[PDB]
Amino acid sequence: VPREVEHFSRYSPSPLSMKQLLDFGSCERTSFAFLRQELPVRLANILKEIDILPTQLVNTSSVQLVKSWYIQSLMDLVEFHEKSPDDQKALSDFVDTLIKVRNRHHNVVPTMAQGIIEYKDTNQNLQYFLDRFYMNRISTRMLMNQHILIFSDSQTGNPSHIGSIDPNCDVVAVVQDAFECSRMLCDQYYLSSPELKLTQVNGKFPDQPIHIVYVPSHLHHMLFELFKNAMRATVEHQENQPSLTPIEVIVVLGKEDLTIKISDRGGGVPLRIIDRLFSYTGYGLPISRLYAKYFQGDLNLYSLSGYGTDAIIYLKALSSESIEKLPVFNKSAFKHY
Amino acid sequence: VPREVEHFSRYSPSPLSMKQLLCERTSFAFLRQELPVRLANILKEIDILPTQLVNTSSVQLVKSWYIQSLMDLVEFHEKSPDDQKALSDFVDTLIKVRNRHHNVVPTMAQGIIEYKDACTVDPVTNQNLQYFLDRFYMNRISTRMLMNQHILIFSDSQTGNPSHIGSIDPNCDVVAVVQDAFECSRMLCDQYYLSSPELKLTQVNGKFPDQPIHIVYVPSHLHHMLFELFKNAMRATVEHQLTPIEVIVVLGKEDLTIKISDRGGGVPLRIIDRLFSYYGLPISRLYAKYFQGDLNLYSLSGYGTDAIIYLKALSSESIEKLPVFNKSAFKHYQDWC
Ligand SMILES: O=C1Cc2ccccc2N1
Ligand SMILES: O=C1Cc2ccccc2N1
């Protein structure tokens, strides 16, 4: 690989908290100084893991394209290492570069997925790599979009967000939004959709609306994917029933945790194979769990085979404890392979 | 260690299925071999524990009991399976071994507590201790299972319920066990708190709709799991607050699933794993995993907790999960930011 990839892969990624990510919007020279270093490091770390993939997979035009994109984006960013953070034109050029890198990486996920489709034409090492590859992309997209959406002139994002972070994320509203999105799709596939039976408990502040610092787009993706699976299971398991049981959602805010449990009566899944739902090929649920774990949360499924399934999202209720969960290429990772 | 320990520890334990457990000469020949093998494997594993733990009077007692039991059992390798008094004496020896091992669980626990309270425990050693205790207690669960099966079936005096085959109920009324275990916890709850939550039970037979839920299982093991879960659910309900405890029993094609739900305020995800560190809850999970089942908790901090038991619905797949002291285990004793 290029010298830059070898060099920057020697560094470990530096995870940020969501609090720190918010603080970038409270300064541009500081985000620029961090990103111009951190993004090459993260691209270089995953580029090293791409090389140890099975040759039949790494040699796919898709994977080779992703590798070429990441290499070029890495070079685009290392060009800014000579510039001074006080150089206003360098900051402006840096925003332009991030936008170019963002657009270049826009189709990474489907391109990588297409690469797996060819390789297939169960693999624990591939699951290991895809968790890391997709978590790495989630993190770089997160960082770059935070800078773009705060410091660009045209890319302003949502006015109520600092970058992509909603400091007062209305969790229940995101739930209702994602449920409608899944409901619209469910109606197209079945001409029927379960209703939502939503409960909320604010143990931290009883009877108070539930807000946390979070990335609503990530939360929406997780809930959308879980609702799609809950609705599909409900309709199909009860297709011979005159009605559909609702999907029960409870949103709970605790001292340390924001918990969302989605319960369906869609027949459940045997314990022996429930993990297959998280194996790639079918990237919705695996990516959803990455999103949950990205900021020290988690996503778990507990099924009652013959009855239904509980899906539970755990998010940290404090932004200071919502720290990036990042893969690093080192001896340990090489040993896992 | 004694020669017999070294010799029999070189054998790997032979797990049986519920179906297998469900001729006195054959059971005699198997147990006189298998019980020393299982005692010898865990005895060798005791020897690699930290010296200050092994030197506690508690661990020395456990070691001395296990060694004596092994020697008692090895003496029957000189007897013929066709010797009538040998079979009869062997039952009396199992009864003696069962009495000698009667206090193993609290004794080992005392040694662990004494060691942790008095000595420094590195993170790896602490993880190794939970690993060892899971394996030590599973080992005991398995030797007690096998010994009791032989005693209950072949003893002239210590025969169990005639409706059961040893300790196994070939048509275990799961719901009946759930109700009984709930009342046992309820009686204890009333005595300490002067009040107890009610039971709201539901059952769904997905394998045989509208039919009673029965599987081949050890009702005593199932009772232990549910009793401990009910104790924690009732303790959490009364202390946090009474909302009832909701239980749903589901029979699927492959799984028998029991979900217990309380509203006792839940537990933060950061520390919920500590509930399974080292004894009722971790041993309860061992019981569930003993025949390839499982026991998980997923809590909504600020609201309540769900506890779910998974049991194999088929006796052929209900196979002992036995620890073995081989190179892989000794390796366990010896990637992400
Ligand atoms: O049957 C199912 C499978 C699944 C995955 C994720 C969420 C809900 C469900 N329900
Ligand atoms: O709060 C809690 C803790 C616990 C452990 C086991 C079962 C139920 C519960 N509830």
XYZ file of C-alpha atoms and ligand atoms in Angstrom:
694
model
C 0.000 0.000 0.000
C 1.067 3.646 -0.278
C 3.498 4.961 2.318
C 0.769 7.183 3.774
C -1.448 4.153 4.428
C 1.363 2.260 6.161
C 2.351 5.281 8.252
C -1.096 6.409 9.400
C -2.241 2.836 10.073
C 0.381 2.742 12.848
C -1.739 5.159 14.899
C -4.798 4.107 16.848
C -8.114 5.895 16.186
C -8.998 8.458 18.849
C -12.653 8.001 19.878
C -14.652 11.104 20.739
C -17.647 11.451 23.003
C -20.887 12.918 21.726
C -20.287 15.749 24.198
C -17.006 16.560 22.448
C -18.745 16.331 19.070
C -21.333 18.824 20.315
C -18.540 21.095 21.553
C -17.224 21.495 17.998
C -20.401 23.503 17.377
C -19.978 25.729 20.444
C -13.492 26.472 16.832
C -13.281 25.484 13.164
C -9.484 25.416 13.375
C -9.752 22.849 16.174
C -12.043 20.502 14.237
C -9.872 20.930 11.139
C -6.698 20.162 13.094
C -8.267 17.002 14.520
C -10.000 15.685 11.400
C -7.074 16.180 9.018
C -5.169 13.750 11.276
C -7.908 11.459 12.602
C -9.589 10.722 9.270
C -6.367 9.490 7.588
C -5.723 7.339 10.662
C -9.173 5.746 10.491
C -9.063 5.244 6.722
C -5.568 3.762 7.022
C -6.566 1.373 9.817
C -9.407 -0.149 7.802
C -7.361 -0.123 4.590
C -4.873 -2.460 6.283
C -7.664 -4.863 7.250
C -9.040 -4.847 3.698
C -5.759 -6.356 2.476
C -6.008 -9.522 4.596
C -9.405 -10.374 3.134
C -9.790 -13.537 1.041
C -8.225 -12.885 -2.348
C -11.450 -13.786 -4.161
C -13.154 -10.991 -2.181
C -10.421 -8.337 -2.179
C -9.986 -8.754 -5.946
C -13.648 -7.959 -6.640
C -14.058 -4.748 -8.613
C -16.346 -3.534 -5.822
C -13.860 -3.968 -2.968
C -11.041 -2.647 -5.154
C -13.151 0.448 -5.844
C -13.832 1.034 -2.139
C -10.117 0.612 -1.459
C -9.259 3.099 -4.216
C -11.800 5.606 -2.883
C -10.490 5.369 0.685
C -6.906 5.696 -0.559
C -7.778 8.805 -2.569
C -9.740 10.321 0.316
C -6.785 9.597 2.599
C -4.488 11.411 0.158
C -6.943 14.306 -0.197
C -6.861 14.820 3.576
C -3.098 14.411 4.032
C -2.648 17.280 1.562
C -3.899 19.599 4.324
C -1.158 18.597 6.785
C 1.120 21.371 5.492
C -1.565 24.046 5.895
C -1.987 26.208 8.984
C -5.305 25.986 10.884
C -5.322 29.802 10.828
C -5.308 29.684 7.001
C -8.912 30.624 6.248
C -8.678 29.395 2.654
C -7.378 26.054 3.932
C -10.398 25.697 6.223
C -12.721 26.522 3.324
C -10.855 24.143 1.017
C -11.025 21.540 3.791
C -14.823 21.791 3.889
C -14.866 21.350 0.110
C -12.617 18.300 0.460
C -14.859 16.721 3.103
C -17.875 17.274 0.846
C -15.962 15.623 -2.004
C -14.928 12.723 0.237
C -18.482 12.393 1.562
C -19.891 12.226 -1.967
C -17.159 9.805 -3.049
C -17.996 7.491 -0.128
C -21.762 7.876 -0.633
C -22.092 4.438 -2.275
C -19.541 2.544 -0.162
C -22.080 0.358 1.669
C -23.916 -0.949 -1.434
C -20.589 -1.310 -3.250
C -19.162 -3.382 -0.394
C -22.414 -5.359 -0.236
C -22.166 -6.002 -3.979
C -18.626 -7.244 -3.366
C -19.880 -9.782 -0.827
C -22.550 -10.912 -3.296
C -19.782 -11.761 -5.762
C -17.632 -13.514 -3.153
C -20.638 -15.660 -2.230
C -20.992 -16.474 -5.944
C -21.563 -18.070 8.118
C -18.014 -16.829 7.513
C -16.952 -15.582 10.943
C -13.966 -13.633 9.605
C -16.176 -11.868 7.063
C -18.664 -10.995 9.809
C -15.769 -9.751 11.946
C -14.480 -7.561 9.112
C -17.867 -6.175 8.056
C -18.721 -5.150 11.621
C -15.407 -3.295 11.718
C -15.577 -1.915 8.172
C -19.113 -0.595 8.635
C -18.414 0.748 12.127
C -15.368 2.519 10.693
C -17.497 4.097 7.953
C -20.169 5.111 10.472
C -17.447 6.876 12.458
C -15.809 8.681 9.530
C -19.166 9.748 8.099
C -20.129 10.953 11.584
C -16.972 13.042 11.987
C -16.939 14.503 8.474
C -20.645 15.356 8.530
C -20.252 17.049 11.911
C -17.642 19.376 10.407
C -19.503 19.906 7.122
C -22.865 20.567 8.774
C -21.395 23.090 11.244
C -18.839 25.012 9.171
C -20.026 24.800 5.555
C -21.895 27.695 3.966
C -24.530 25.590 2.164
C -24.725 22.273 4.076
C -26.570 23.349 7.226
C -28.419 20.133 8.066
C -31.288 20.331 10.520
C -31.526 23.774 12.189
C -32.234 22.166 15.582
C -29.112 19.960 15.418
C -25.458 20.730 16.063
C -24.166 18.960 12.995
C -26.114 15.692 13.091
C -26.524 15.624 16.894
C -29.837 16.660 18.419
C -28.943 17.852 21.953
C -32.636 17.398 22.881
C -33.501 14.348 20.791
C -37.233 13.644 21.105
C -36.889 9.866 21.299
C -40.625 9.137 21.206
C -40.981 11.369 18.140
C -38.220 9.445 16.360
C -39.982 6.203 17.317
C -43.285 7.411 15.872
C -41.531 8.673 12.740
C -39.627 5.431 12.133
C -42.761 3.384 12.829
C -44.710 5.319 10.189
C -41.875 4.828 7.695
C -41.918 1.075 8.305
C -45.723 1.090 8.337
C -45.819 2.677 4.877
C -43.525 -0.052 3.548
C -45.436 -2.820 5.337
C -48.714 -1.664 3.774
C -47.117 -1.874 0.325
C -46.001 -5.481 0.860
C -49.102 -6.777 2.688
C -51.958 -4.215 2.449
C -51.992 -4.270 6.261
C -49.696 -3.210 9.066
C -49.691 -3.602 12.860
C -50.592 -0.554 14.904
C -48.244 1.036 17.435
C -48.956 0.683 21.153
C -46.354 3.017 22.649
C -45.608 3.541 26.336
C -43.006 5.817 27.892
C -41.575 5.872 31.409
C -39.235 8.650 32.536
C -37.713 7.087 35.622
C -35.164 9.905 35.680
C -37.835 12.649 35.578
C -41.291 11.101 36.052
C -44.059 12.386 33.755
C -41.462 14.510 31.926
C -40.850 14.209 28.161
C -37.896 11.974 27.337
C -34.959 13.737 25.683
C -31.308 12.749 25.371
C -28.340 13.921 23.356
C -28.291 11.618 20.351
C -27.936 11.388 16.578
C -31.590 11.101 15.468
C -30.607 9.708 12.057
C -28.871 6.756 13.723
C -31.785 6.175 16.101
C -34.218 6.363 13.186
C -32.263 3.729 11.245
C -32.222 1.329 14.203
C -35.942 1.702 14.896
C -36.867 1.577 11.207
C -35.023 -1.716 10.739
C -36.456 -3.241 13.917
C -39.976 -2.117 13.009
C -39.646 -3.584 9.511
C -38.757 -6.955 11.042
C -41.436 -6.753 13.743
C -44.131 -5.880 11.196
C -43.071 -8.532 8.686
C -43.096 -11.179 11.421
C -46.444 -10.010 12.822
C -48.271 -9.966 9.478
C -46.869 -13.287 8.266
C -47.336 -15.144 11.560
C -50.949 -13.912 11.843
C -51.821 -13.936 8.127
C -54.542 -16.519 8.874
C -55.930 -14.347 11.742
C -58.766 -11.831 11.202
C -56.683 -9.042 12.791
C -53.125 -7.993 13.621
C -51.811 -7.566 17.134
C -50.140 -4.169 17.644
C -46.421 -3.699 18.060
C -45.786 -2.691 21.669
C -43.006 -0.156 22.254
C -41.861 1.087 25.657
C -39.365 3.955 25.871
C -37.641 4.177 29.259
C -35.235 6.856 30.471
C -33.094 5.801 33.416
C -30.246 7.485 35.238
C -27.611 5.992 32.911
C -29.620 4.377 30.108
C -32.200 5.159 27.464
C -33.914 1.849 26.697
C -36.389 1.066 23.911
C -38.069 -2.351 23.849
C -40.041 -3.336 20.737
C -42.322 -6.344 21.275
C -44.185 -8.222 18.545
C -46.253 -11.390 18.379
C -44.753 -12.488 15.069
C -44.080 -16.112 15.989
C -40.509 -15.642 17.216
C -37.298 -17.307 16.082
C -35.589 -20.437 17.482
C -32.687 -19.610 19.778
C -30.356 -21.719 17.628
C -30.613 -19.364 14.629
C -31.523 -15.970 16.118
C -27.900 -14.879 15.672
C -28.227 -15.427 11.912
C -30.412 -12.308 11.882
C -27.230 -10.364 12.710
C -25.054 -12.040 10.066
C -24.563 -9.968 6.934
C -26.446 -11.290 3.906
C -29.569 -8.579 4.947
C -27.528 -5.653 6.251
C -30.333 -3.882 8.128
C -30.205 -5.486 11.566
C -26.388 -5.908 11.727
C -25.900 -2.233 10.852
C -28.583 -1.263 13.373
C -26.624 -2.990 16.136
C -23.455 -1.214 15.008
C -25.311 2.094 15.324
C -26.403 1.197 18.859
C -22.903 0.100 19.892
C -21.207 3.005 18.093
C -21.795 5.254 21.131
C -21.422 2.544 23.814
C -25.038 1.404 23.469
C -26.258 -1.992 22.376
C -29.021 -3.806 20.517
C -30.248 -7.253 21.551
C -33.003 -9.622 20.454
C -34.763 -11.998 22.851
C -37.281 -14.211 21.077
C -39.988 -16.567 22.325
C -40.109 -19.083 19.484
C -43.766 -19.782 18.767
C -45.033 -16.446 20.110
C -43.031 -13.325 19.325
C -39.830 -11.365 19.752
C -38.516 -8.610 21.995
C -36.013 -6.200 20.455
C -34.236 -3.912 22.913
C -32.130 -0.831 22.159
C -29.777 0.501 24.842
C -28.385 4.026 24.515
C -26.272 5.965 26.990
C -28.358 8.717 28.578
C -25.278 10.938 29.103
C -23.387 12.427 26.163
C -20.092 12.277 28.077
C -20.433 8.478 28.305
C -21.487 8.178 24.635
C -17.999 7.451 23.318
C -17.130 6.169 19.855
C -16.631 2.402 19.677
C -13.941 2.178 17.017
C -12.053 -0.720 15.413
C -8.264 -0.582 15.390
C -5.893 -2.621 13.227
C -3.335 -4.177 15.580
C -1.924 -7.545 16.625
C -5.179 -8.447 18.386
C -7.299 -7.764 15.298
C -4.840 -9.675 13.111
C -5.059 -12.598 15.550
C -8.866 -12.611 15.399
C -8.579 -13.198 11.645
C -2.023 -34.894 42.817
C -2.843 -38.566 43.414
C -2.218 -40.950 40.538
C -5.927 -41.672 40.058
C -6.618 -37.949 39.633
C -3.958 -37.583 36.932
C -5.111 -40.756 35.173
C -8.819 -39.919 35.095
C -8.262 -36.227 34.329
C -6.661 -37.340 31.052
C -10.123 -38.555 30.035
C -12.599 -36.066 28.649
C -16.051 -36.007 30.300
C -18.721 -37.814 28.291
C -21.902 -35.697 28.121
C -25.223 -37.513 28.141
C -28.521 -36.432 26.636
C -31.800 -36.162 28.495
C -32.928 -38.950 26.165
C -30.082 -41.211 27.312
C -30.761 -40.539 30.997
C -34.471 -41.095 30.322
C -29.768 -51.848 33.403
C -28.049 -51.336 36.749
C -24.904 -53.125 35.558
C -24.412 -50.704 32.657
C -25.106 -47.600 34.748
C -22.694 -49.013 37.335
C -19.890 -49.456 34.802
C -20.464 -45.995 33.318
C -20.610 -44.027 36.572
C -17.649 -45.793 38.190
C -15.677 -44.467 35.200
C -17.412 -41.170 34.431
C -17.732 -39.754 37.950
C -13.969 -40.072 38.627
C -13.344 -38.538 35.192
C -15.478 -35.496 35.986
C -14.113 -35.167 39.523
C -10.574 -35.512 38.163
C -11.021 -32.847 35.480
C -12.190 -30.225 37.970
C -9.591 -31.275 40.563
C -6.838 -30.540 38.043
C -8.507 -27.210 37.286
C -8.521 -26.350 41.001
C -4.735 -26.755 41.066
C -4.166 -23.835 38.655
C -6.124 -21.343 40.770
C -4.208 -18.665 42.704
C -2.198 -20.249 45.501
C -3.848 -18.179 48.240
C -7.282 -19.322 47.056
C -6.338 -23.008 46.846
C -4.812 -22.796 50.333
C -8.048 -21.595 51.943
C -9.495 -24.211 54.272
C -12.647 -24.059 52.139
C -10.962 -25.025 48.868
C -8.829 -27.587 50.711
C -12.036 -29.119 52.075
C -13.592 -29.261 48.599
C -10.416 -30.813 47.197
C -10.249 -33.376 50.013
C -13.926 -34.280 49.570
C -13.597 -34.644 45.794
C -10.432 -36.730 46.166
C -12.015 -39.055 48.734
C -15.106 -39.477 46.557
C -12.905 -40.282 43.559
C -10.976 -42.916 45.521
C -14.231 -44.407 46.828
C -15.524 -44.685 43.261
C -12.269 -46.025 41.804
C -12.352 -48.970 44.223
C -15.341 -50.305 42.267
C -13.147 -50.825 39.197
C -12.055 -54.010 41.009
C -15.657 -55.278 41.220
C -17.603 -57.022 38.483
C -20.808 -55.428 37.122
C -22.344 -58.884 37.709
C -21.591 -58.709 41.453
C -24.920 -58.106 43.187
C -23.490 -56.712 46.424
C -21.133 -54.516 44.382
C -24.097 -52.825 42.695
C -25.812 -52.430 46.073
C -22.637 -51.135 47.732
C -22.149 -48.746 44.807
C -25.534 -47.131 45.476
C -24.587 -46.732 49.135
C -21.303 -45.179 47.991
C -23.119 -42.685 45.764
C -25.327 -41.778 48.733
C -22.173 -41.321 50.813
C -20.601 -39.188 48.071
C -23.783 -37.126 47.777
C -23.719 -36.505 51.530
C -19.999 -35.692 51.450
C -20.566 -33.148 48.657
C -23.724 -31.717 50.253
C -21.995 -28.470 51.318
C -19.742 -28.015 48.272
C -21.525 -24.940 46.902
C -21.394 -22.734 50.036
C -17.947 -24.072 50.966
C -16.372 -23.128 47.624
C -18.207 -19.797 47.763
C -16.732 -19.163 51.215
C -13.234 -19.763 49.860
C -13.828 -17.370 46.961
C -15.224 -14.658 49.238
C -12.348 -15.112 51.689
C -9.870 -14.811 48.814
C -11.441 -11.745 47.186
C -11.962 -9.948 50.501
C -8.387 -10.546 51.692
C -6.253 -10.509 48.528
C -5.813 -8.360 45.455
C -7.386 -9.866 42.335
C -6.172 -8.692 38.936
C -8.766 -8.259 36.164
C -7.634 -11.437 34.398
C -7.670 -13.462 37.623
C -11.140 -12.104 38.412
C -12.383 -13.155 34.973
C -10.674 -16.524 35.461
C -12.497 -16.965 38.780
C -15.936 -16.470 37.230
C -14.814 -18.821 34.453
C -13.660 -21.424 36.976
C -16.779 -21.109 39.132
C -19.125 -21.468 36.162
C -17.215 -24.636 35.296
C -16.851 -25.908 38.866
C -20.551 -25.454 39.616
C -21.619 -26.902 36.270
C -19.369 -29.874 37.013
C -21.114 -30.398 40.361
C -24.529 -29.996 38.733
C -23.556 -32.785 36.339
C -22.150 -35.200 38.935
C -25.144 -34.600 41.203
C -27.467 -35.202 38.243
C -25.797 -38.493 37.308
C -25.444 -39.782 40.878
C -29.027 -38.900 41.810
C -30.327 -40.610 38.671
C -28.614 -43.859 39.676
C -29.647 -43.607 43.336
C -33.265 -42.713 42.592
C -33.669 -45.558 40.085
C -31.608 -48.381 41.613
C -31.625 -47.665 45.355
C -33.645 -49.986 47.568
C -34.538 -47.169 49.997
C -33.827 -43.766 48.297
C -36.167 -44.054 45.322
C -37.799 -40.874 44.064
C -41.249 -40.060 42.765
C -42.506 -43.172 40.907
C -44.021 -40.903 38.245
C -40.505 -39.694 37.362
C -37.592 -41.593 35.835
C -34.966 -40.797 38.440
C -35.108 -37.011 38.735
C -36.475 -36.600 35.181
C -40.151 -35.939 34.472
C -40.806 -37.249 30.928
C -43.902 -34.996 30.765
C -42.861 -32.059 32.924
C -45.810 -29.742 33.522
C -43.796 -26.559 32.956
C -46.634 -24.253 34.006
C -47.154 -26.200 37.236
C -43.458 -25.793 38.064
C -43.694 -22.064 37.322
C -46.676 -21.695 39.652
C -44.988 -23.686 42.425
C -41.700 -21.790 42.175
C -43.639 -18.517 42.285
C -45.424 -19.495 45.507
C -42.155 -20.560 47.136
C -40.646 -17.149 46.400
C -43.952 -15.543 47.394
C -43.855 -17.200 50.822
C -40.311 -15.936 51.397
C -41.260 -12.475 50.126
C -44.192 -12.195 52.542
C -42.048 -13.228 55.513
C -39.469 -10.501 54.828
C -41.584 -7.700 53.308
C -45.079 -8.624 54.615
C -46.389 -8.391 51.031
C -45.749 -9.974 47.643
C -46.685 -9.359 43.996
C -49.269 -11.544 42.313
C -48.655 -13.816 39.323
C -50.119 -13.045 35.892
C -49.280 -16.147 33.858
C -49.890 -16.787 30.165
C -49.060 -19.897 28.149
C -48.827 -20.360 24.382
C -48.222 -23.771 22.801
C -46.955 -22.966 19.323
C -45.942 -26.575 18.702
C -49.337 -28.017 19.739
C -51.888 -25.179 19.813
C -54.333 -25.261 22.740
C -52.578 -28.290 24.282
C -50.741 -28.525 27.619
C -47.064 -27.580 27.543
C -44.901 -30.578 28.437
C -41.234 -31.362 27.834
C -38.751 -33.884 29.171
C -36.890 -32.109 31.953
C -35.620 -32.195 35.530
C -38.374 -30.346 37.449
C -36.047 -29.648 40.392
C -33.575 -27.865 38.104
C -36.399 -25.864 36.523
C -37.757 -25.027 39.979
C -34.363 -23.717 41.112
C -34.065 -21.386 38.108
C -37.568 -19.951 38.442
C -37.363 -19.648 42.230
C -34.202 -17.535 42.055
C -35.598 -15.392 39.237
C -38.845 -14.897 41.150
C -36.947 -13.932 44.313
C -35.061 -11.197 42.455
C -38.190 -10.059 40.610
C -40.213 -9.868 43.833
C -37.388 -8.196 45.758
C -37.009 -5.630 42.973
C -40.771 -5.036 42.787
C -41.349 -4.473 46.508
C -38.199 -2.400 47.056
C -38.731 -0.227 43.973
C -42.386 0.297 44.929
C -47.325 -3.805 44.046
C -47.298 -4.412 40.309
C -47.767 -8.116 39.490
C -45.074 -10.272 37.937
C -45.986 -11.281 34.386
C -44.826 -14.690 33.158
C -45.335 -16.145 29.684
C -44.539 -19.788 28.907
C -44.057 -20.607 25.224
C -43.405 -23.958 23.546
C -41.845 -23.697 20.098
C -40.581 -26.280 17.641
C -37.100 -26.306 19.204
C -37.412 -24.146 22.331
C -39.331 -23.999 25.576
C -39.209 -20.331 26.565
C -40.190 -18.706 29.865
C -40.121 -14.913 30.160
C -40.555 -13.312 33.589
C -41.298 -9.573 33.618
C -41.301 -7.291 36.663
C -41.542 -3.551 37.208
C -38.947 -3.310 39.973
C -37.185 -0.306 38.464
C -34.654 -2.244 36.395
C -30.866 -2.272 36.499
C -28.385 -0.113 34.535
C -26.834 -2.020 31.651
C -23.357 -1.087 32.895
C -23.734 -3.277 36.001
C -26.388 -5.858 35.096
C -23.607 -8.335 34.281
C -22.479 -8.111 37.911
C -25.655 -10.005 38.845
C -24.046 -13.091 37.267
C -20.659 -12.603 38.927
C -19.689 -14.635 41.975
C -24.580 -17.114 43.621
C -28.249 -17.897 43.040
C -28.465 -16.134 39.678
C -25.192 -17.442 38.161
C -25.938 -20.992 39.317
C -29.467 -20.614 37.942
C -27.982 -19.767 34.546
C -25.742 -22.830 34.804
C -28.840 -24.972 35.360
C -30.415 -23.496 32.226
C -27.233 -24.029 30.202
C -26.618 -27.517 31.622
C -28.874 -29.092 28.976
C -28.048 -26.563 26.223
C -30.548 -23.991 27.475
C -29.762 -20.435 28.470
C -30.801 -17.712 30.903
C -30.639 -14.022 30.007
C -31.691 -10.774 31.643
C -32.561 -7.625 29.735
C -33.591 -4.725 31.938
C -35.109 -1.317 31.246
C -33.374 0.832 33.856
C -36.047 3.026 35.417
C -38.952 0.642 34.774
C -38.354 -3.081 35.176
C -36.536 -6.217 34.106
C -37.226 -9.175 31.835
C -35.697 -12.562 32.640
C -35.920 -15.236 29.946
C -35.198 -18.962 30.298
C -34.545 -21.071 27.204
C -34.846 -24.854 27.424
C -34.451 -27.345 24.602
C -37.862 -28.760 23.714
C -36.323 -32.045 22.482
C -34.668 -34.504 24.856
C -32.298 -35.619 22.084
C -30.848 -32.092 21.941
C -30.836 -31.687 25.754
C -27.173 -32.667 26.065
C -24.972 -32.011 29.087
C -22.822 -28.893 28.748
C -19.747 -30.160 30.558
C -16.432 -28.422 31.250
C -13.258 -30.257 30.274
C -9.731 -29.480 31.477
C -7.862 -29.683 28.170
C -5.342 -27.480 26.366
C -8.078 -25.058 25.288
C -9.276 -24.517 28.864
C -5.729 -24.019 30.147
C -5.252 -21.517 27.313
C -8.244 -19.492 28.516
C -6.516 -19.228 31.902
C -3.188 -18.277 30.299
C -9.105 -5.094 18.741
C -11.496 -2.291 19.726
C -10.622 1.033 21.344
O -39.539 -12.324 14.267
C -38.789 -11.368 14.382
C -37.336 -11.265 13.905
C -36.964 -9.877 14.332
C -35.774 -9.188 14.185
C -35.709 -7.880 14.688
C -36.820 -7.291 15.321
C -38.018 -7.997 15.463
C -38.055 -9.280 14.962
N -39.117 -10.166 14.983
O -34.289 -5.842 39.135
C -34.110 -7.024 38.893
C -32.796 -7.807 38.999
C -33.216 -9.180 38.574
C -32.474 -10.339 38.461
C -33.134 -11.494 38.032
C -34.507 -11.473 37.725
C -35.248 -10.296 37.841
C -34.574 -9.174 38.266
N -35.087 -7.904 38.458
